[PDB]
Amino acid sequence: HWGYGKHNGPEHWHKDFPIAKGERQSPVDIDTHTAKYDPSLKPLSVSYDQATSLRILNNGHAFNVEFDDSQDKAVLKGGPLDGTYRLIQFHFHWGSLDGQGSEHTVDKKKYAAELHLVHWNTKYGDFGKAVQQPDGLAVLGIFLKVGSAKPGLQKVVDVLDSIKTKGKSADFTNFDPRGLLPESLDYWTYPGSLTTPPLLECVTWIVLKEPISVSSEQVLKFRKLNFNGEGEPEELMVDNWRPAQPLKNRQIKASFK
Numbered sequence: 001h002w003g004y005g006k007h008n009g010p011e012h013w014h015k016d017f018p019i020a021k022g023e024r025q026s027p028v029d030i031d032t033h034t035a036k037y038d039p040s041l042k043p044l045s046v047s048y049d050q051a052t053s054l055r056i057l058n059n060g061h062a063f064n065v066e067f068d069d070s071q072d073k074a075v076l077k078g079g080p081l082d083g084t085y086r087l088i089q090f091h092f093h094w095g096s097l098d099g100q101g102s103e104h105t106v107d108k109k110k111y112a113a114e115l116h117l118v119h120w121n122t123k124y125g126d127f128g129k130a131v132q133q134p135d136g137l138a139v140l141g142i143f144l145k146v147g148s149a150k151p152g153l154q155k156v157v158d159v160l161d162s163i164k165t166k167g168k169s170a171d172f173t174n175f176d177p178r179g180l181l182p183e184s185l186d187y188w189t190y191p192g193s194l195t196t197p198p199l200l201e202c203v204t205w206i207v208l209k210e211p212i213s214v215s216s217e218q219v220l221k222f223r224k225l226n227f228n229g230e231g232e233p234e235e236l237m238v239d240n241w242r243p244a245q246p247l248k249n250r251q252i253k254a255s256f257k
């Protein structure tokens with residue numbers, strides 16, 4: 001019964017998930033004045049040409065756009081990563097107001113939302129095995145600010161009415177996640193965790209420097225989603241973000257000078 005309410009939000013999660021107070025928790029604040037350029041980092045390789053989206057699901061905490069991860073169809077390689085990481089799903093975190101919503105912050109700045117493209121390391125065979133490993137996942141995080149619309153988001157926006165409440169799913173084929181990327185693949189990277197329970201410390205985070213812009217109408221439609229199931233009391237799916245956690249004994253590295 002974890003969530004983002006008064007009585008079950010991030011400050012409570014440690015009671016059921018004690019790693020919430022662990023050494024490698026996410027998100028974090030990215031201090032651009034202390035992150036250091038690392039010339040050993042490589043460019044990211046994002047290979048999404050063969051991606052096969054299947055379905056969109058409201059899980060009661062966000063919605064996931066799910067992919068076929070039974071072959072190397074949509075993969076992330078390079079950057080800080082060794083090996084090949086397969087796209088399994090993407091989802092977002094967003095606010096009730098345009099001045100909050102992101103999980104990572106940049107010099108304490110909060111963005112309106114944050115996109116997470118989740119990938120698992122193929123050496124571990126399946127997502128469930130991967131999350132048990134320190135290098136099991138690679139998450140590409142992308143900030144959203146409100147401004148111009150993002151045309152490549154609109155197909156997501158338009159299906160939201162079909163998945164208003166927890167537990168609803170809808171077919172969602174042929175969606176192209178390349179339409180959610182910014183122009184630049186410059187990034188910061190650090191070792192961390194899932195940002196929702198079970199909060200496992202299995203993630204190489206790759207957070208893009210350049211945000212995407214979405215329109216105010218696009219974000220408004222996200223805010224019409226519900227955390228509750230159909231026929232339960234309506235609670236808008238907003239502010240489904242975890243705040244920044246202590247960096248502890250980690251360094252954030254930049255791919256760019």
Ligand SMILES: [Zn+2]
Pocket residue numbers: 091092093116195
């Ligand atoms: Zn996330």
